[PDB]
Coordinates of C-alpha atoms and ligand atoms in Angstrom, one line a residue:
X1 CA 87.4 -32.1 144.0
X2 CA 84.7 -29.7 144.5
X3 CA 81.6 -30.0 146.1
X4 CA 79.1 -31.1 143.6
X5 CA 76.1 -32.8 145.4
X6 CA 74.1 -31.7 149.0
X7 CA 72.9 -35.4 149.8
X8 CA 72.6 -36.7 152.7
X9 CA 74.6 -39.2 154.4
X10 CA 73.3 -42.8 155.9
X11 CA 75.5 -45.0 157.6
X12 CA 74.3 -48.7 157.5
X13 CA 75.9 -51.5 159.8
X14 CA 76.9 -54.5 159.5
X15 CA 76.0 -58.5 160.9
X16 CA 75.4 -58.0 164.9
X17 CA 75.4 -54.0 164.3
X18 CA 73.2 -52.2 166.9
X19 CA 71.6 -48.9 166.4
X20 CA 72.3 -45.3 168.6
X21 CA 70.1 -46.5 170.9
X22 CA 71.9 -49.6 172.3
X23 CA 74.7 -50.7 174.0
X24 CA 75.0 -47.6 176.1
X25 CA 75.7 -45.5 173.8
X26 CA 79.1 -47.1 172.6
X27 CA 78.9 -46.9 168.5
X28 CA 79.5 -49.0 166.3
X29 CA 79.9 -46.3 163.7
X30 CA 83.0 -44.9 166.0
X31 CA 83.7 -47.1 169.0
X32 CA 86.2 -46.5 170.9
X33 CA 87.7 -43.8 168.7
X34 CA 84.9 -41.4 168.8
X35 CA 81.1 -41.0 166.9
X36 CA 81.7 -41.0 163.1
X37 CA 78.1 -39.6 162.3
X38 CA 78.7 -36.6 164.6
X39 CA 82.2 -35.8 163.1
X40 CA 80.6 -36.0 159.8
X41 CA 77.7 -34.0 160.9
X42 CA 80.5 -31.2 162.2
X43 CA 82.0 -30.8 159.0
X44 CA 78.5 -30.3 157.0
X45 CA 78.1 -33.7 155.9
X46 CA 74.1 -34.5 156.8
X47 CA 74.1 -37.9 158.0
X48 CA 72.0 -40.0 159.9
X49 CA 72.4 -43.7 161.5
X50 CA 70.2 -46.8 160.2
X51 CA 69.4 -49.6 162.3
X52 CA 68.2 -52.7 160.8
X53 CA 68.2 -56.6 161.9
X54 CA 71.9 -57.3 163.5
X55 CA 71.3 -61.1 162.5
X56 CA 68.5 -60.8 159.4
X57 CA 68.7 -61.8 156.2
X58 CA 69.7 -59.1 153.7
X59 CA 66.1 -59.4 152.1
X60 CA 64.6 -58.2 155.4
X61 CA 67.4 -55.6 156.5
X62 CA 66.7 -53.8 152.8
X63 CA 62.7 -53.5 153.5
X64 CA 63.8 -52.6 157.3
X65 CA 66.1 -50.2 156.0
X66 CA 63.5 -48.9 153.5
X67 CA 61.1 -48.2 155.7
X68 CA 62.9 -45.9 158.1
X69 CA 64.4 -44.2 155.7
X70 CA 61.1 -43.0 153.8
X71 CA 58.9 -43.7 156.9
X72 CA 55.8 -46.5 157.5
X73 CA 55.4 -49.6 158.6
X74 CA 57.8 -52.5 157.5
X75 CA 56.8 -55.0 154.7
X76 CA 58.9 -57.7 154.0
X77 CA 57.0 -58.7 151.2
X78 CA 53.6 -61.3 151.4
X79 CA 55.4 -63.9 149.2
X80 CA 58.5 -63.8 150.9
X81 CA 57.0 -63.6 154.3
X82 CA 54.5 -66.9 153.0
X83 CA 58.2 -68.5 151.9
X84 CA 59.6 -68.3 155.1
X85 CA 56.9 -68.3 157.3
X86 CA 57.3 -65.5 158.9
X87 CA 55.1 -62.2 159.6
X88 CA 54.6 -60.1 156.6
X89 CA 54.6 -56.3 158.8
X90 CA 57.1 -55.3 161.1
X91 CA 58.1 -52.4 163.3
X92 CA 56.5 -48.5 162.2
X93 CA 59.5 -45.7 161.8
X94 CA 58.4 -42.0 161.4
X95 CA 60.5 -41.4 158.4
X96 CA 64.2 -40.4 159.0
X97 CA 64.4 -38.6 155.2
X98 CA 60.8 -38.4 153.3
X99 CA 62.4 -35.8 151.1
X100 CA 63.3 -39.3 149.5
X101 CA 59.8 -39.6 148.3
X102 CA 60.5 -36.2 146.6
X103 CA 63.4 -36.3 144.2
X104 CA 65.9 -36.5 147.0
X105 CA 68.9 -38.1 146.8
X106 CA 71.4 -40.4 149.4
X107 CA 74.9 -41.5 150.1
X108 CA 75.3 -44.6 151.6
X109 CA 78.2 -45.7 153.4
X110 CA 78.0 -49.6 154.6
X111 CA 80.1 -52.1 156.6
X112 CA 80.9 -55.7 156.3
X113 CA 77.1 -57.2 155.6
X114 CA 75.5 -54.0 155.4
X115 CA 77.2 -53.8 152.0
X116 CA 74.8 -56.4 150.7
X117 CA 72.5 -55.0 152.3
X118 CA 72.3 -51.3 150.7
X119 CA 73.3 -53.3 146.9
X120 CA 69.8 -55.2 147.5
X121 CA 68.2 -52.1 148.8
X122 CA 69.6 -50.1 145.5
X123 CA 68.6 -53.3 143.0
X124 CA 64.7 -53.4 144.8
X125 CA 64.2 -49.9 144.5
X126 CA 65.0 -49.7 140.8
X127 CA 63.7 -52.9 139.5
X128 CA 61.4 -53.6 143.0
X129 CA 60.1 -57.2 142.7
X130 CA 58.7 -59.3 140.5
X131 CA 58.0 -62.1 142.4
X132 CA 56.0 -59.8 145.1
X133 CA 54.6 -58.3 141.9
X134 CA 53.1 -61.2 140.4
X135 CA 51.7 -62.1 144.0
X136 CA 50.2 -59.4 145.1
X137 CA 48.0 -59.5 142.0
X138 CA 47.8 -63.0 142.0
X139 CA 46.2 -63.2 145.4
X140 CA 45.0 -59.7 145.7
X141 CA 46.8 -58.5 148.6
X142 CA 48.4 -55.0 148.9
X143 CA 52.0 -54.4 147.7
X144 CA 54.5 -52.3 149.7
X145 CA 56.1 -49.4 146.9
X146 CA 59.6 -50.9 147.5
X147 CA 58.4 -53.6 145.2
X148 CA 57.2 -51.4 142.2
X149 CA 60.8 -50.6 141.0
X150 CA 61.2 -47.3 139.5
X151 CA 62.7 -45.4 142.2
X152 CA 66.1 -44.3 141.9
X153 CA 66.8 -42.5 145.5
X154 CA 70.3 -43.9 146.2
X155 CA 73.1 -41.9 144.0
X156 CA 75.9 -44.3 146.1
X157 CA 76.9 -47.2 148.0
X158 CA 80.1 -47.3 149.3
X159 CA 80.8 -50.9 151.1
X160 CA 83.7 -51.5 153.6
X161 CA 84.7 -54.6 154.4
X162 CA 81.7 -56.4 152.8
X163 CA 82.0 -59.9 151.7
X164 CA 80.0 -59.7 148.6
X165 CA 81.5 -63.0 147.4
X166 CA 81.1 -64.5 151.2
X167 CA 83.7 -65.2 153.8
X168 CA 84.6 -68.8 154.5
X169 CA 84.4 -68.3 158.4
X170 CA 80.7 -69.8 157.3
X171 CA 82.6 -72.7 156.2
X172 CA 84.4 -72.9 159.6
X173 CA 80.9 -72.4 161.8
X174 CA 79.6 -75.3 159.0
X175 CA 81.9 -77.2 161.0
X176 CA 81.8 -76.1 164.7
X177 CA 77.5 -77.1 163.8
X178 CA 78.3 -80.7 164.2
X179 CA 79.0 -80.8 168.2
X180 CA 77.9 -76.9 168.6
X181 CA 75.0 -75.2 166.2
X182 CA 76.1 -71.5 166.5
X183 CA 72.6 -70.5 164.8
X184 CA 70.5 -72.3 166.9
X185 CA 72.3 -71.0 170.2
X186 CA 72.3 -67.5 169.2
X187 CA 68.5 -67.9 168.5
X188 CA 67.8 -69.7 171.7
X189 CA 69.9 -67.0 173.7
X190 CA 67.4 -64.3 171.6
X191 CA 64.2 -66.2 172.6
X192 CA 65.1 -66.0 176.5
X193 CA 66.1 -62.1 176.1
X194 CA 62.8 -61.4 174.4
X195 CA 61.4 -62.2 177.7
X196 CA 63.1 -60.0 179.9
X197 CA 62.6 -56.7 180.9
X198 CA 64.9 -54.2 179.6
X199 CA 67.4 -56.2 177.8
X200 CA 66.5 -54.8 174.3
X201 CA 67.6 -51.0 175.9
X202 CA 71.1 -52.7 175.8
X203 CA 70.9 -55.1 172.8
X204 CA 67.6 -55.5 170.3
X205 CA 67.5 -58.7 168.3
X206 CA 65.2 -57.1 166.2
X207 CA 63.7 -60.3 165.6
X208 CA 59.7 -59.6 165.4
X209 CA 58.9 -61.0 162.9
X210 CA 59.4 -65.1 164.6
X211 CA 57.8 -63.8 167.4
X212 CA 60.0 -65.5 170.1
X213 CA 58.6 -63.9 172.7
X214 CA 55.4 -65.3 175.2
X215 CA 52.5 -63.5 173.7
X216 CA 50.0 -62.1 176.5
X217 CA 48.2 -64.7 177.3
X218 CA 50.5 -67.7 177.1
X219 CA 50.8 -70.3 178.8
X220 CA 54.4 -71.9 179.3
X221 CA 52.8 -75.1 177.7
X222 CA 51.7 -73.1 174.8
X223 CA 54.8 -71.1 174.1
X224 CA 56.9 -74.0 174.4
X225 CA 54.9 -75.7 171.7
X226 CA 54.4 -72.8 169.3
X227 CA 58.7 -72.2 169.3
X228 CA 59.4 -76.1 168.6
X229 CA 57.1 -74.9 165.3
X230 CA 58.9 -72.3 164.4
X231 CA 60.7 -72.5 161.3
X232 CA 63.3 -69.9 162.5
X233 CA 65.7 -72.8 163.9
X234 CA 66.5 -73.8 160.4
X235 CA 65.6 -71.0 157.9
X236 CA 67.5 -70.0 155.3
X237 CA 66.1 -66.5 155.7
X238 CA 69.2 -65.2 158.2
X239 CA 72.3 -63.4 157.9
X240 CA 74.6 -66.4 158.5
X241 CA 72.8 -68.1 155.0
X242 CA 73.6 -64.6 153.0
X243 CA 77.1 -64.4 154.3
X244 CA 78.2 -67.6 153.4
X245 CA 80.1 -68.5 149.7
X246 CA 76.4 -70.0 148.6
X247 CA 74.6 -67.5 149.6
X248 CA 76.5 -64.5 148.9
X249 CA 76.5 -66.0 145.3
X250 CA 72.9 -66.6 144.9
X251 CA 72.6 -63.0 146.2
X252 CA 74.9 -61.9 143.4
X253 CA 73.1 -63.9 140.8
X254 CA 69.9 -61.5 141.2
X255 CA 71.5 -58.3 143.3
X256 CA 73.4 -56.1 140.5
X257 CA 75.2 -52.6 139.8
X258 CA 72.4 -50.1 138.7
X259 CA 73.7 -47.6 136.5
X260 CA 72.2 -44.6 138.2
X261 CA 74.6 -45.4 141.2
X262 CA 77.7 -45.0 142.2
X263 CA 79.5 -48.1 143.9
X264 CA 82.9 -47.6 145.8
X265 CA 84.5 -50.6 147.8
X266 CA 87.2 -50.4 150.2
X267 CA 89.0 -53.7 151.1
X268 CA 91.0 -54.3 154.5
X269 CA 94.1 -56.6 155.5
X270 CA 95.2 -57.7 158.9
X271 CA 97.6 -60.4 157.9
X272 CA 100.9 -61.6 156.7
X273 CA 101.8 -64.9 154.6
X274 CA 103.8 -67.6 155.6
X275 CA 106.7 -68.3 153.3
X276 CA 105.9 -71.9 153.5
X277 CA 102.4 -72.6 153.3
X278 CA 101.1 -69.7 151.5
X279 CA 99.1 -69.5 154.8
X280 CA 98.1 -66.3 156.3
X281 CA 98.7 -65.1 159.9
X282 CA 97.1 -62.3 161.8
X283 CA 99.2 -59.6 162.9
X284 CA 99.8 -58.3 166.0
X285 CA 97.3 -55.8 166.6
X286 CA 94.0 -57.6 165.1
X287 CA 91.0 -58.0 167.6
X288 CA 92.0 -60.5 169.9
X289 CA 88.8 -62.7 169.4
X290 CA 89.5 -62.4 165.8
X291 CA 93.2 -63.1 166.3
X292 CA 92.5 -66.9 168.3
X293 CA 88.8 -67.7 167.0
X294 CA 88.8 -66.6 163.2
X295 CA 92.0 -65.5 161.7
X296 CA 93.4 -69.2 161.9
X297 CA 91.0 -70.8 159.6
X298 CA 90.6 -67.5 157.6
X299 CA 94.3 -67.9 156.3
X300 CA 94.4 -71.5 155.8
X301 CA 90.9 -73.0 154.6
X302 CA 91.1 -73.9 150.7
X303 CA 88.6 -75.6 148.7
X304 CA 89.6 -75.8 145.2
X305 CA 86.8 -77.0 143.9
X306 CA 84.7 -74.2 145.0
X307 CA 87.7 -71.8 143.4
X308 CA 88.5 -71.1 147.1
X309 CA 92.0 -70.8 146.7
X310 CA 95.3 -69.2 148.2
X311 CA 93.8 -65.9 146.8
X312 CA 90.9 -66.5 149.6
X313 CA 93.4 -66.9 152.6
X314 CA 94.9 -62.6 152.8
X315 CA 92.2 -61.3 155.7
X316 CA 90.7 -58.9 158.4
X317 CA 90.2 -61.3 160.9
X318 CA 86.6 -61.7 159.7
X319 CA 86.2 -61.6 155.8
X320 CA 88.5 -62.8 153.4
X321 CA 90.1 -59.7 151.4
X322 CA 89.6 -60.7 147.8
X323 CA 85.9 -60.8 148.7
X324 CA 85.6 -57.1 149.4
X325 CA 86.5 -55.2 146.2
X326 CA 82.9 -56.1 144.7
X327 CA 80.8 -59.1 144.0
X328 CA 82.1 -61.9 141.3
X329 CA 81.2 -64.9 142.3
X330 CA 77.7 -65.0 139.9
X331 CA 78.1 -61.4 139.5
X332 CA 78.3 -59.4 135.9
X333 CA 79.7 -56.5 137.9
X334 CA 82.4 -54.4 136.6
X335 CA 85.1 -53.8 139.1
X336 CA 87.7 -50.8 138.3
X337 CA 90.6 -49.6 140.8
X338 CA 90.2 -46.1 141.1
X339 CA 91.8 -43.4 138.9
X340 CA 90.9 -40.4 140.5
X341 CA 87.6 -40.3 138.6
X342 CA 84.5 -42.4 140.1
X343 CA 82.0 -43.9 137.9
X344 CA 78.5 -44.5 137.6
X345 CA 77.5 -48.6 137.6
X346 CA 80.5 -49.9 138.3
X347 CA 82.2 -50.7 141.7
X348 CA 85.1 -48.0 142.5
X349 CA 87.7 -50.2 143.9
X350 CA 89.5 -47.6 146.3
X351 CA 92.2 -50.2 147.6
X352 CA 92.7 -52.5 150.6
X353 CA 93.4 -51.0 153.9
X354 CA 95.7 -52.5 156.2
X355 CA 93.3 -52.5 158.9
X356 CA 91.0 -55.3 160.6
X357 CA 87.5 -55.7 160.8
X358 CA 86.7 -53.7 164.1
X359 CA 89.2 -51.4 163.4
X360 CA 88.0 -49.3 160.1
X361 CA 85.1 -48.6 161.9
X362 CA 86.8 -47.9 165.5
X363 CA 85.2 -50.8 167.5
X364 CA 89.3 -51.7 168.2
X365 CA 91.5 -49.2 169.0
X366 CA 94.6 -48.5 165.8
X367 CA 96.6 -45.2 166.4
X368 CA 98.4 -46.5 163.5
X369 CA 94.9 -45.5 161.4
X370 CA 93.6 -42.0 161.5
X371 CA 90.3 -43.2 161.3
X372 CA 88.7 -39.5 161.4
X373 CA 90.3 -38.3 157.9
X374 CA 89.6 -41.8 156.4
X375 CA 85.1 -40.9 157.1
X376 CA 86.2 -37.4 156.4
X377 CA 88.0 -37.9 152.8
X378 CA 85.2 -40.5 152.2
X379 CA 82.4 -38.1 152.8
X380 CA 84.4 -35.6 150.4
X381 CA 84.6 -37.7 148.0
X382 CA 80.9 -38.3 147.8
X383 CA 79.9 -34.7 147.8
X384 CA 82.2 -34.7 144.5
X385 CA 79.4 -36.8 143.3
X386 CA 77.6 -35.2 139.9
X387 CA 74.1 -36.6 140.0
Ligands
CA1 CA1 93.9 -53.3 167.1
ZN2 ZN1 62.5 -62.7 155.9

């Protein structure tokens, strides 16, 4: 497979990733294994690292992701910002590759959410918006390019672990909510650190756009008042509403394969099946938090009326497998396991792993998986790539 493209590289995390910057420098492209980016960047693969909102919507992560890439101030779009009532302008990145803006191509390589992620960012740059569109005239405001459609930059998406269809751990936190809201904790925890020096150094919500924090002049009264208003606490504009089997759906009713871009999946197992209950168990060797907290329910919860059935319950410790090979649920995708040929528009299936969630990207420790030639035949593979 020779070399048949010079694109660069950009990896894209995943729900709760953090950017090179954070958590003292331990990756989350790498872990404990090593720093994926650099061994890429050693054997002439050109990639860089995005860094978008750990707990965002997908919506907000693409025009996050957008922005750095090509450079300028974020714009989540003045409809969508209206809808959700939250600010329309974000953070200002210099541009990590304005050659983009030039007939430039890139790869992307995704986990888990950021899957979703780089589909929406591929489907909004060729089609853009037509909602933002018809607003932006409407109401004569200014309209970020992203929008337009027409731009074709992205020549793949490769997505690893990704629940395009959802993962029912949603359905187990739907349940936790009643004596313990998860969302509203994590948000509450995010409002206190916004407050305190430093903490972003180690971990950045990257949540702007609510404006948690005290502003300036504040008064504790004020502040206090201005967060019970917020309609953060209960938006449907987060990662937790995308990642569930609803929203991942309703993402895949709008979010399709373009046919200028190449899509490869890779799935990953952690699991073995009861010969009993059809349930599934986590092996020895998942995550530990995965192993106690997740796992459990992963294997067992069935809703047949949803069409969540025993196909649902094989898992990383995170997602549910049969989730990861592309989107379906409300999707018109085409999903093809690979024949030593990839192909333009529809997703690549490249086979399920047996690895966990943390594990394919080095977060927990596997000799068993030689996680360096896994990034390394990956990143060949894509330079094979005939634009
Ligand atoms: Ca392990
Ligand atoms: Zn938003």
């Amino acid at each position: 497979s020779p070399r048949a493209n010079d694109a660069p590289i950009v990896l894209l995390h995943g729900f709760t990733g953090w950017g090179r910057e954070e958590m003292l420098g331990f990756k989350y492209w790498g872990g404990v294994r090593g720093d994926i980016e650099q061994w890429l960047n050693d054997n002439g693969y050109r990639t860089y690292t995005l860094a978008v909102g750990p707990l965002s919507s997908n919506a907000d992560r693409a025009c996050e992701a957008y922005a750095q890439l090509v450079g300028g101030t974020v714009d989540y779009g003045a409809a969508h910002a209206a809808k959700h009532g939250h600010a329309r302008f974000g953070r200002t990145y210099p541009g990590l590759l304005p050659e983009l803006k030039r007939g430039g191509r890139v790869h992307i390589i995704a986990h888990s959410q950021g899957g979703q992620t780089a589909r929406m960012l591929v489907s909004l740059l060729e089609n853009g918006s037509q909602e933002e569109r018809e607003y932006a005239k409407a109401h004569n405001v200014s309209l970020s390019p992203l929008f337009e459609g027409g731009h074709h930059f992205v020549l793949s998406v490769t997505t690893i672990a990704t629940p395009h269809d959802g993962t029912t751990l949603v359905n187990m936190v739907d349940f936790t909510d009643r004596f313990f809201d998860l969302q509203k904790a994590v948000l509450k925890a995010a409002a206190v650190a916004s407050n305190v020096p430093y903490t972003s150094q180690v971990y950045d919500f990257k949540l702007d756009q609510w404006g948690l924090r005290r502003q300036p002049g504040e008064s504790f009264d004020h502040y206090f008042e201005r967060l019970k208003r917020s309609p953060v606490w209960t938006s449907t504009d987060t990662a937790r509403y995308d990642l569930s089997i609803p929203g991942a759906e309703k993402l895949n009713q709008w979010v399709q394969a373009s046919p200028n871009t190449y899509y490869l999946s890779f799935s990953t197992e952690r699991t073995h099946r009861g010969a009993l209950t059809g349930n599934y168990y986590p092996e020895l060797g998942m995550n530990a938090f995965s192993a106690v907290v997740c796992a459990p329910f992963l294997g067992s919860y069935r809703n047949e009326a949803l069409g969540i059935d025993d196909r649902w319950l094989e898992n990383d410790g995170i997602v549910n497998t049969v989730s990861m090979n592309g989107p379906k649920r409300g999707s018109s995708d085409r999903i093809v396991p690979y024949d030593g040929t990839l192909k333009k528009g529809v997703w690549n299936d490249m086979g399920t792993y047996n690895v966990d969630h943390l594990e394919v990207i080095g977060v927990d420790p596997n000799p068993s998986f030689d996680i360096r030639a896994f990034y390394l035949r990956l990143a060949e593979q894509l330079a094979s790539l005939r634009p």
